[PDB]
Amino acid sequence: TGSLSVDNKKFWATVESSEHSFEVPIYAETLDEALELAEWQYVPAGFEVTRVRPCVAPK
Structure with a gap:
């Protein structure tokens, strides 16, 4: 599903x-x-979470 939001x-x-x-x-x-x-959650993701933005989309 491409629309997971x-x-x-x-x-x-x-x-x-x-x-x-x-x-x-x-x-x-x-x-x-x-x-x-x-x-x-993103500790084992390897990268560093620099930002977090709202998708706020129905799709």
């Missing part, structure tokens, strides 16, 4: 490294929650 608060945490900045779908209520979610 189905009503749930989908966020994109920019997990960045020197070579490339990545993004993984965070699911939280607020942006602060999404933000901690990244730095919380």
Whole structure:
């Protein structure tokens, strides 16, 4: 499903490294929650979560 932002608060945490900045779908209520979610869940992701943005899309 390309439209995974189905009503749930989908966020994109920019997990960045020197070579490339990545993004993984965070699911939280607020942006602060999404933000901690990244730095919380994204430890074994390798990259460093530099940003978190709201997808806030129905698709």
